[PDB]
Design a protein around this ligand. Structure first.
Ligand SMILES: COC(=O)[C@@H](NC(=O)CNC(=O)[C@H](CS)NCc1ccc(-c2ccccc2)cc1)C(C)C
Ligand SMILES: [Ca+2]
Ligand SMILES: [Ca+2]
Ligand SMILES: [Ca+2]
Ligand SMILES: [Ca+2]
Ligand SMILES: [Ca+2]
Ligand SMILES: [Ca+2]
Ligand SMILES: [Zn+2]
Ligand SMILES: [Zn+2]
Ligand SMILES: [Zn+2]
Ligand SMILES: [Zn+2]
Lengths: 173, 170
């Protein structure tokens, strides 16, 4: 696993997120659920908890964007870069953006929103790309029919626990 | 009425539109509806026709945005600037952006999407602001329009027709 330079990380255990805009690709409730599910992945293996805001600045601002969108890194059209997220800190830090020139889906027929969301929130929490091919934090996406049996890899757990530790409610093997 | 300088206007009657993203404030069908109704206002009194695209570059790219969003004219938080649109042309020209720091509504409890969209498309089609207080293109239309009895004023019709003519075989 790998972190960003200086290992920036949230100094709070409860983070807020806000879904700022919605893609034409899915019904609004489907976007919400993949985001909820994506956050739940990280919540299960650390002390971190998450609540949603319907207004104001949330730690993790989530949006869909096409090409130039007000930050330093314009998206790039269909394919290639799928999304990007910023390491922990104030403002644009912690936020995640999703390229709408991608067809976001609830299954693997397009680009699975849950999977990309879980991988991006991984950056939002301070994990950089993993070299481990089995990790969620691996820089390359792959269509995996298996969304019902999704499991964080041990490399991921290790990387996120090195930052925040395990859940206070769980035993350690 | 008024047109932009050098009177930029579409050189074709079939214009495509695309709703690039959706606001949290309303159900997506409410957005589609209001956008369609805004387009209809103008199509009804000209030879212009519209069709929707879900991919690629449409003439009129519609989006919601907050603060800095990829153009040189950032939105300003709640109220004041509700939205902005570019006159006819290629690329960003003809596109319309809507400030999501406003609360877009179907009715008048927030900022009415239909109304603002109708004004902005007026700009996307080549109309600049009117000096007539009753016109949709009057700068203060959003504070002066009665949505129950909404109809395009004749100053708005005179202006859009000056550019594109009346509907075929009137
Ligand atoms: C083969 O896939 C790709 O290379 C795709 N592009 C990328 O992956 C480039 N990466 C990106 O644009 C962003 C940069 S933060 N990475 C998002 C991302 C999201 C999820 C996973 C993932 C990992 C393991 C299991 C399941 C999914 C991996 C990467 C597209 C060409 C389809
Ligand atoms: Ca942030
Ligand atoms: Ca892309
Ligand atoms: Ca899309
Ligand atoms: Ca355009
Ligand atoms: Ca505003
Ligand atoms: Ca809003
Ligand atoms: Zn971005
Ligand atoms: Zn990544
Ligand atoms: Zn703009
Ligand atoms: Zn105006």
């Amino acid at each position: 696993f790998r972190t960003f330079p200086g290992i920036p990380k949230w100094r709070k255990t409860h983070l807020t997120y806000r879904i700022v805009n919605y893609t034409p690709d899915l019904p609004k409730d489907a976007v919400d659920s993949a985001v909820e599910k994506a956050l739940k992945v990280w919540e299960e293996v650390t002390p971190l908890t998450f609540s949603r805001l319907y207004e104001g600045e949330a730690d993790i601002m989530i949006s869909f964007a096409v090409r130039e969108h007000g930050d330093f890194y314009p998206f790039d059209g269909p394919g290639n870069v799928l999304a990007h997220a910023y390491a922990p800190g104030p403002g644009i830090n912690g936020d995640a953006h999703f390229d709408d020139d991608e067809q976001w889906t609830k299954d693997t027929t397009g680009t699975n929103l849950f999977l990309v969301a879980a991988h991006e929130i991984g950056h939002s929490l301070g994990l950089f790309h993993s070299a481990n091919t089995e990790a969620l934090m691996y820089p390359l996406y792959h269509s995996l029919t298996d969304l019902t049996r999704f499991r964080l890899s041990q490399d991921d757990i290790n990387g996120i626990q090195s930052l925040y530790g395990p859940p206070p409610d769980s035993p350690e093997t």
